[PDB]
């Protein structure tokens, strides 16, 4: 199910029950596998090359304007709004990401924890730094995403 204004590349591998919100763009070689249940992708989300989103059984609601960079792997049951998952970051099965979270490249979130709002996780040790200054409201990065996403990819 592709919402009006969403761009899904012919090279994208989508399997299972997947709903793509408006203005969402999925790059070539992205893999979205909804095996355990439907994956709901909100509006304005960006999923880059080699991004792997799997909803698997223990052998998924994704909020608005989230960015999934190259080679990201996300198994999260729930994600909030305005989250950034950097390249090669791993988000584990039982990670609950709230709104305004930034996960640095090569970070492994295996902890059974609700990450509080405005937390930046960085470094090999996944240090949590609560940003004591209001992270500049991502209204500026959302404005660029809303104007750039429809212009750089062949809308079906």
């Amino acid at each position: 199910k592709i919402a009006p204004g969403a761009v899904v590349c012919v090279e994208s591998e989508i399997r299972g029950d997947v709903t793509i919100g408006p203005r969402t763009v999925i790059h070539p070689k992205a893999r979205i596998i909804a095996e355990a249940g439907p994956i709901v992708i909100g509006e304005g989300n960006l999923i880059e090359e080699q991004a792997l989103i799997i909803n698997a059984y223990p052998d998924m609601i994704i909020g608005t304007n989230n960015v999934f960079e190259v080679g990201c792997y996300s198994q999260a049951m729930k994600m909030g709004d305005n989250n950034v998952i950097e390249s090669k970051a791993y988000v584990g099965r039982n990670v609950i990401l709230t709104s305004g979270c930034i996960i640095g490249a090569c970070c492994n979130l295996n902890t059974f924890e609700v990450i509080p709002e405005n937390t930046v996780i960085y470094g090999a040790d996944c240090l949590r730094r609560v940003q004591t200054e209001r992270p500049q409201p991502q209204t500026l990065q959302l404005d660029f995403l809303m104007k750039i996403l429809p212009n750089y990819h062949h809308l079906k």
Binding site: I102, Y122, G123, Q131, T132, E133, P135
Partner: peptide, 11 residues
């Protein structure tokens, strides 16, 4: 650019 730390975080 990496951890998003700014001089404003310390006032």
């Amino acid at each position: 650019g990496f951890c998003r730390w700014t001089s404003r975080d310390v006032g």
